[PDB]
From a paper:
We demonstrate the broad applicability of this approach through the de novo design of binding proteins to 12 diverse protein targets with different shapes and surface properties. Biophysical characterization shows that the binders, which are all smaller than 65 amino acids, are hyperstable and, following experimental optimization, bind their targets with nanomolar to picomolar affinities.
We succeeded in solving crystal structures of five of the binder–target complexes, and all five closely match the corresponding computational design models.
Author numbering:
A (entry chain A): 229 to 353
B (entry chain B): -2 to 61
The structure:
């Protein structure tokens, strides 16, 4: 087997190669909200190399989140140059029916780009 | 097929990501994005790679 001092991520500047960012499973999570309330989506990004954060919202046109060609309608909400030592947050204040749909968190470094998604459901009051 | 496609798409990302984060000249960044866009749409065949191509272009386009 393999015996090392740490089973965590490879330290920055080590003989081990760096990897693409790792997004923790379950974040963002599918949340449900009532109109007018505030919603916060999380995204825990692990990375040795510097990653850039990006939040998108999937846009629906004619009942479809994809174009006639097949590329997704997405809207850039937030970007960041470095990941946090805590967590990444997307603040959705005073949510309405139009805020519902698919939200995607993205983190990419010198190696790759990783992305996870979640669905926000908005119910009436 | 699909495996060789995603490997080719990763090479385009790393090559583009290295240039955007290196020079701050917005004109040179737009040229690498344009170049990365043309190669990425040619490799993409199914919906998983098309969404992945769209995601990477916007990631590099909005890179600080």
């Amino acid at each position: 087997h393999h015996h090392h001092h740490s089973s965590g991520l490879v330290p920055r500047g080590s003989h081990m190669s760096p990897h693409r960012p790792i997004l923790q499973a379950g974040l963002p999570a599918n949340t449900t909200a009532v109109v007018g309330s505030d919603v916060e989506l999380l995204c825990k990004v692990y990375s040795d190399a510097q990653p850039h954060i990006q939040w998108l919202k999937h846009i629906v046109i004619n009942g479809s989140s994809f174009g006639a060609d097949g590329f997704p309608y997405v809207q850039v909400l937030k970007t960041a140059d470095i990941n946090s030592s805590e967590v990444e947050v997307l603040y959705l204040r005073n949510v309405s029916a139009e805020d519902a749909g698919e939200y995607t968190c993205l983190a990419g470094n010198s190696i790759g780009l990783s992305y996870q998604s979640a669905w926000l459901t908005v119910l009436p009051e | 097929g699909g495996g060789d496609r995603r490997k080719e798409m990763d090479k385009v990302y790393r090559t583009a990501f290295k240039r955007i984060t290196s020079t701050p000249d917005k004109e040179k960044r737009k040229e690498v994005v344009k170049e990365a866009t043309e190669q990425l749409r040619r490799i993409a065949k199914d919906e998983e790679e098309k969404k992945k191509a769209a995601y990477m272009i916007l990631f590099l386009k909005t890179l600080g």
